Amino acid sequence: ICGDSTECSNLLLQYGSFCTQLNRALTGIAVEQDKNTQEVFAQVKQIYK
Amino acid sequence: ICGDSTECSNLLLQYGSFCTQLNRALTGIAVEQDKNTQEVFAQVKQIYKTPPIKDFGGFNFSQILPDPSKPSKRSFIEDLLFNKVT
Amino acid sequence: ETKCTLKSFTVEKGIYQTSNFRVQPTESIVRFPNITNLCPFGEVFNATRFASVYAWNRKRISNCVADYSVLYNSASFSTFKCYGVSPTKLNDLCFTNVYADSFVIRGDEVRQIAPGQTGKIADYNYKLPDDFTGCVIAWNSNNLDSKVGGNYNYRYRLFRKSNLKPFERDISTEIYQAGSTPCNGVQGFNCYFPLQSYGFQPTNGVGYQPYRVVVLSFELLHAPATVCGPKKSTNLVKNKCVNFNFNGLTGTGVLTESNKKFLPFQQFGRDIADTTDAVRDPQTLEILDITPCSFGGVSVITPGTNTSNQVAVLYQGVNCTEVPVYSTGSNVFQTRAGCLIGAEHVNNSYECDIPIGAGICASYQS
Amino acid sequence: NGLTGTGVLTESNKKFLPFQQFGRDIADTTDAVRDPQTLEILDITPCSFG
Amino acid sequence: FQTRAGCLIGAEHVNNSYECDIPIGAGICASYQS
Amino acid sequence: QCVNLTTRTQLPPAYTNSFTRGVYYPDKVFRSSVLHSTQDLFLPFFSNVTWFHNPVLPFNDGVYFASTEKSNIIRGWIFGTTLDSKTQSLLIVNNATNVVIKVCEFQFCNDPFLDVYYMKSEFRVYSSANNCTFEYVSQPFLKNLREFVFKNIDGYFKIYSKHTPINLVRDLPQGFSALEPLVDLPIGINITRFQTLLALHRSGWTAGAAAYYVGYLQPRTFLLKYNENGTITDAVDCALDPLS
Amino acid sequence: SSTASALGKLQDVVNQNAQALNTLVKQLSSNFGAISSVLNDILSRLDPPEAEVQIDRLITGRLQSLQTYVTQQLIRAAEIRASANLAATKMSECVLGQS
Amino acid sequence: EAEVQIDRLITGRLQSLQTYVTQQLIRAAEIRASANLAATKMSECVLGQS
Amino acid sequence: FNGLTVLPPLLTDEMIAQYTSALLAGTITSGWTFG
Numbered sequence A: 001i002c003g004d005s006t007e008c009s010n011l012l013l014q015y016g017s018f019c020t021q022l023n024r025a026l027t028g029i030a031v032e033q034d035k036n037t038q039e040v041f042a043q044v045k046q047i048y049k
Numbered sequence B: 001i002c003g004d005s006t007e008c009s010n011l012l013l014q015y016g017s018f019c020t021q022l023n024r025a026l027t028g029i030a031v032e033q034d035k036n037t038q039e040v041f042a043q044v045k046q047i048y049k050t051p052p053i054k055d056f057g058g059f060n061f062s063q064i065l066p067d068p069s070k071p072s073k074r075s076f077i078e079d080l081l082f083n084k085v086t
Numbered sequence C: 001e002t003k004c005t006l007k008s009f010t011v012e013k014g015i016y017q018t019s020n021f022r023v024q025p026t027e028s029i030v031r032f033p034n035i036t037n038l039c040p041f042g043e044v045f046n047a048t049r050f051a052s053v054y055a056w057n058r059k060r061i062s063n064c065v066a067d068y069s070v071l072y073n074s075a076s077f078s079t080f081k082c083y084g085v086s087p088t089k090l091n092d093l094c095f096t097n098v099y100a101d102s103f104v105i106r107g108d109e110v111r112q113i114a115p116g117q118t119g120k121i122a123d124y125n126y127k128l129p130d131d132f133t134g135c136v137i138a139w140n141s142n143n144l145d146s147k148v149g150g151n152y153n154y155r156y157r158l159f160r161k162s163n164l165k166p167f168e169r170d171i172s173t174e175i176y177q178a179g180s181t182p183c184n185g186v187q188g189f190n191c192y193f194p195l196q197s198y199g200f201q202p203t204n205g206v207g208y209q210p211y212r213v214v215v216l217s218f219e220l221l222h223a224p225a226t227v228c229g230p231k232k233s234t235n236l237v238k239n240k241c242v243n244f245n246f247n248g249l250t251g252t253g254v255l256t257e258s259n260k261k262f263l264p265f266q267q268f269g270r271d272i273a274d275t276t277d278a279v280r281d282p283q284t285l286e287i288l289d290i291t292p293c294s295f296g297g298v299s300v301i302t303p304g305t306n307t308s309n310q311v312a313v314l315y316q317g318v319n320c321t322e323v324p325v326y327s328t329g330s331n332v333f334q335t336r337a338g339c340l341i342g343a344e345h346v347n348n349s350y351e352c353d354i355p356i357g358a359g360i361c362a363s364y365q366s
Numbered sequence D: 001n002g003l004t005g006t007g008v009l010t011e012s013n014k015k016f017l018p019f020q021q022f023g024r025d026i027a028d029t030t031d032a033v034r035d036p037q038t039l040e041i042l043d044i045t046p047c048s049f050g
Numbered sequence E: 001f002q003t004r005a006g007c008l009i010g011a012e013h014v015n016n017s018y019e020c021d022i023p024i025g026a027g028i029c030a031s032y033q034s
Numbered sequence F: 001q002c003v004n005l006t007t008r009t010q011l012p013p014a015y016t017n018s019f020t021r022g023v024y025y026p027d028k029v030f031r032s033s034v035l036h037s038t039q040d041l042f043l044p045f046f047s048n049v050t051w052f053h054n055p056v057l058p059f060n061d062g063v064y065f066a067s068t069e070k071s072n073i074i075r076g077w078i079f080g081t082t083l084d085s086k087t088q089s090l091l092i093v094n095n096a097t098n099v100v101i102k103v104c105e106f107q108f109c110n111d112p113f114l115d116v117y118y119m120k121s122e123f124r125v126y127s128s129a130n131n132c133t134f135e136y137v138s139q140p141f142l143k144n145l146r147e148f149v150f151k152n153i154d155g156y157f158k159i160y161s162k163h164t165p166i167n168l169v170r171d172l173p174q175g176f177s178a179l180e181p182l183v184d185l186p187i188g189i190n191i192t193r194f195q196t197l198l199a200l201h202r203s204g205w206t207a208g209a210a211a212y213y214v215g216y217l218q219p220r221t222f223l224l225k226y227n228e229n230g231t232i233t234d235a236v237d238c239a240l241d242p243l244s
Numbered sequence G: 001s002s003t004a005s006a007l008g009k010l011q012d013v014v015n016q017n018a019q020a021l022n023t024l025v026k027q028l029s030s031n032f033g034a035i036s037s038v039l040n041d042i043l044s045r046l047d048p049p050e051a052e053v054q055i056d057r058l059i060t061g062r063l064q065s066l067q068t069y070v071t072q073q074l075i076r077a078a079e080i081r082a083s084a085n086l087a088a089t090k091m092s093e094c095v096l097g098q099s
Numbered sequence H: 001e002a003e004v005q006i007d008r009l010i011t012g013r014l015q016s017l018q019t020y021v022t023q024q025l026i027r028a029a030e031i032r033a034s035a036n037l038a039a040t041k042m043s044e045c046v047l048g049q050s
Numbered sequence I: 001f002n003g004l005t006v007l008p009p010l011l012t013d014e015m016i017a018q019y020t021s022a023l024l025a026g027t028i029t030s031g032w033t034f035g
């Protein structure tokens, strides 16, 4: 949004926390992707040959 | 939004019917929750009762079958589960 | 109300949310400190001599009761322009640390005194912050501040290395090098004196006659209130939903005697989510407890306009203690979901028709 | 030449046609510039972050 | 240590292989022993 | 009327560990059982605090002054830019009776001392005081560690204080104790340096064991924990360690 | 009985709901470019014609936050409903008969 | 008025970011449903006869 | 890049291939008993 501008950062500061929840949602999505792959593929206790 | 102020209400009134939609969404959510619970649990038509004598071929269900001492009529495992989570 | 909310002349059986109910305030109370000493304003307003613009006279006033109404209604002020507050409400607020800045400038420079303003005085002699709160007063003084012999004692800054800071004073008088050669305290080529005098003369027209300018600056809730305005303080009322004006902080609720252990330097408490919870009355120094008045939602239970026209009312999450149109109606029932008026309790058990809550629900027979 | 920005500049082998001044690829993101004096193509990459 | 996910400081790289408990990325993860 | 001191106890100052001292109440709002994050001027944790066993020390932004003194040798303080009549200066004295706060253009001496006749009356800190601006009198402040925090913000001079009996011999105690606000002054000065005053036995002075600690404040963010009774019981410094 | 932290899913659901409510109620203390975050102070210092300007900023900020909260609630409710359907099928199949 | 202009830019960019995040959430829900179906299929048809 | 980054997946492609190989060898040799 601001691109390394002090005045822009100060102006954005007075919008409260509109950015903690955005990153929270993105991190939740990423963890969900990792869990999806793990649960669809990891289904054996050993590695057979 | 307004906190019991007439001027704020008058200003907000010209924003259309946002609040009716907002309340409708939450009401739908609540009704959905109630239906979820009802359809998950209400699967039987009659409330059966266990016989007073319990001789199931050596199997022991006392830890799961409800205990009359508890005021909520719950069982040991259910009590542990309810205490474990806030 | 159900018909109006559903936008129909017929309603089918069910439960509908209509509106909310609230306890209304009864009376009003005001509490200000005992301090009543008059505040010195004519001493600075009718001051004979005002300093130069670069050496603007600064005064701090506190611990008084100030009457702005006599200042507001008086027509002696040519310019009376406030920024952060409407003038008519200056008699309703108690401040701390009022600052007054007085000086004399030319007729055409009065416009330069404003937030976010650029000019000569606005950046080299006197700067106002962008978020400044207060008021500015200006009046003509060509009768006494103008001399036929030429008023030369009034000087202004003309050159500086850079612009000033808000509410910053510059008094240094050093030669300024306008070019690429050292001055060494010599006002010669590319070297100039930063101060320039004025030519205030009565023969001069408008825009050049002397004008007296005083700015008043305030603060908003930075310390215990010390300078108030004229307003009577009423008596204290307990356990009544009333609107209060404690020391300029307004609100509405019920006041309870509180046992919270304040310490002699706090003035008011607060809880999680930043809500004003407890206050200390100025006149008695007693720690109170604010609580919002009772309120909640209402719902209607009807068997359908097709069948009947009598309904029942549910007040959500409200004890059966403050009910007040159905003041009496029928027998009143108290449930985990709130209070219920217009339906009769029975000790049988049927299937659920119109779910109400906490495992209980209503149906039509009454 | 009035086009400002922060980054790190290295040598580049892109061949500008003799009348352009700078280049971009997608969504108006400048990638190469031509210095007004020496007339050579420089490549801009962002300063590292994470 | 330099990894496909970035750089890591305060951790020691070993040549063994254990069960994963605190995922880091690119197929590597850390645990407490140090 | 003052004399120069001849004993030159010139030696490099000592250094010691600040630990977790210098925490004060930032605002005047009561709170309870709440964790509050606030950004202000504070003493960074585990900093290098100077130890003296009366030179000139810069004021910087804020000053944390501590003393485990016995018999209350320390008397007061001087604040100013050049500590001469050419510039406004501030003076604090805590004698046997009420404490006296003054703001004038004093003419101080090179060795500001007090002298004590065993008849305890002698005043040899300044020779002249022509222009006086502010005066104030308050209650007296006074094996026993006493800590003060001095700040100068927005024409306001803030003084925080805290005293507590101690049993440890030399080092600063490894405990936690918030500093309730003591006094505020609505005076704006351009203070840049400060001194310290002593009470020597003029009976022939004998005072060389004056051990005290001096530290400087920096702007940073803290996380403070309030108890049920509204007393700060612990704090966390933000920019000290990744775990922090 | 002995080992704890075996019920992570329900605890996570509760924590998510509580966090959503907490941030929603904390959003009330933002200026959104106005001069104050409390309506009574604005109403007690300024005349209406200049007061509506600040009140508009307050209104738009709070309303936008409310819509964000409602949308998040809708998504979470959809996920919970999917889980509830799965649970209902599991109880119907693995309890009332041999799967 | 630079503050006014920056405020307009800020609100526009914030709205765009919100839109992107919401779309990502919807797509993630759909992908999760697909992944659950894949897991069930692989458990039922690879580890046994259906 | 304009303030946006892409994070690598936790499981690399070789590990996924190894899972598939193990699954397929197990289903060839042991039938459904290994499940």
Ligand SMILES: *[C@@H]1O[C@H](CO)[C@@H](O[C@@H]2O[C@H](CO)[C@@H](O)[C@H](O)[C@H]2NC(C)=O)[C@H](O)[C@H]1NC(C)=O
Pocket: B060, B061, B062, B063
């Ligand atoms: C089923 O198991 C329970 C324990 O889970 C048995 O209850 C125990 O009985 C013995 C013998 O009286 C007591 O010493 C224990 O204290 C009991 N345990 C508890 C937790 O109270 C019960 O007896 C078993 N059922 C049968 C038929 O033997």
Ligand SMILES: *[C@@H]1O[C@H](CO)[C@@H](O[C@@H]2O[C@H](CO)[C@@H](O)[C@H](O)[C@H]2NC(C)=O)[C@H](O)[C@H]1NC(C)=O
Pocket: C041, C042, C043, C045, C046
């Ligand atoms: C400055 O002095 C003038 C007097 O010339 C004040 O004006 C009058 O003050 C008296 C005070 O008793 C009032 O009764 C009059 O109504 C005022 N006006 C006139 C036209 O006589 C003036 O108030 C003084 N300044 C301030 C700030 O008080």
Ligand SMILES: *[C@@H]1O[C@H](CO)[C@@H](O[C@@H]2O[C@H](CO)[C@@H](O)[C@H](O)[C@H]2NC(C)=O)[C@H](O)[C@H]1NC(C)=O
Pocket: C319, C320, C321
């Ligand atoms: C509604 O208000 C009544 C009156 O205050 C409550 O009754 C009180 O209950 C408490 C707790 O048991 C007793 O200590 C008081 O003596 C009761 N007061 C009276 C006058 O009997 C009642 O509990 C409230 N209902 C709810 C749901 O809170």
Ligand SMILES: *[C@@H]1O[C@H](CO)[C@@H](O[C@@H]2O[C@H](CO)[C@@H](O)[C@H](O)[C@H]2NC(C)=O)[C@H](O)[C@H]1NC(C)=O
Pocket: F080, F081, F082, F190, F191, F192
């Ligand atoms: C506060 O006092 C100090 C001196 O104690 C002032 O510092 C002087 O600044 C000028 C301008 O840069 C220099 O020429 C002097 O050499 C400085 N004095 C010293 C002793 O270094 C400082 O400017 C004063 N602050 C204000 C706001 O007036």
Ligand SMILES: *[C@@H]1O[C@H](CO)[C@@H](O[C@@H]2O[C@H](CO)[C@@H](O)[C@H](O)[C@H]2NC(C)=O)[C@H](O)[C@H]1NC(C)=O
Pocket: F085, F086, F087, F105, F130, F131
């Ligand atoms: C004490 O204050 C007086 C007045 O404020 C100072 O006297 C001024 O000295 C300057 C020196 O250049 C003169 O220009 C002024 O005209 C004097 N004013 C008056 C009213 O006489 C005096 O210098 C101050 N003493 C100090 C600073 O030590």
Ligand SMILES: *[C@@H]1O[C@H](CO)[C@@H](O[C@@H]2O[C@H](CO)[C@@H](O)[C@H](O)[C@H]2NC(C)=O)[C@H](O)[C@H]1NC(C)=O
Pocket: F095, F096, F097, F098, F100, F120, F121, F137
């Ligand atoms: C302590 O300092 C004060 C002031 O320098 C001395 O004088 C007292 O000043 C206050 C100020 O109003 C008066 O109320 C007192 O009556 C003065 N006398 C006393 C005895 O307090 C005071 O004498 C000094 N005390 C000692 C023991 O030197």
Ligand SMILES: *[C@@H]1O[C@H](CO)[C@@H](O[C@@H]2O[C@H](CO)[C@@H](O)[C@H](O)[C@H]2NC(C)=O)[C@H](O)[C@H]1NC(C)=O
Pocket: F227, F228, F229
């Ligand atoms: C916090 O306040 C409570 C309430 O006063 C304190 O609990 C008691 O306080 C009284 C003093 O009024 C003591 O005489 C009692 O001994 C206290 N009860 C105890 C200690 O069990 C409490 O001590 C205060 N401090 C803390 C840390 O809770």
Ligand SMILES: *[C@@H]1O[C@H](CO)[C@@H](O)[C@H](O)[C@H]1NC(C)=O
Pocket: C034, C282, C283, C284, C285
């Ligand atoms: C204020 O005045 C009343 C009546 O004179 C008195 O009872 C009260 O104690 C006063 N308050 C203070 C703080 O002195």
Ligand SMILES: *[C@@H]1O[C@H](CO)[C@@H](O)[C@H](O)[C@H]1NC(C)=O
Pocket: C306, C307
């Ligand atoms: C509803 O109204 C219809 C007429 O439109 C009537 O025939 C029916 O009996 C009504 N049902 C009731 C009152 O339960």
Ligand SMILES: *[C@@H]1O[C@H](CO)[C@@H](O)[C@H](O)[C@H]1NC(C)=O
Pocket: C345, C346, C347, C348
């Ligand atoms: C209510 O309960 C009482 C005893 O608790 C019982 O006698 C009565 O029949 C029940 N029903 C009604 C309508 O009172």
Ligand SMILES: *[C@@H]1O[C@H](CO)[C@@H](O)[C@H](O)[C@H]1NC(C)=O
Pocket: E013, E014, E015
């Ligand atoms: C063990 O690991 C270290 C670095 O982690 C490496 O330098 C060393 O060669 C390894 N030893 C063997 C036997 O592979």
Ligand SMILES: *[C@@H]1O[C@H](CO)[C@@H](O)[C@H](O)[C@H]1NC(C)=O
Pocket: F015, F016, F017, F047, F048
């Ligand atoms: C303080 O600085 C001195 C410099 O002489 C140094 O020797 C000492 O270790 C420092 N203290 C700490 C706690 O690092």
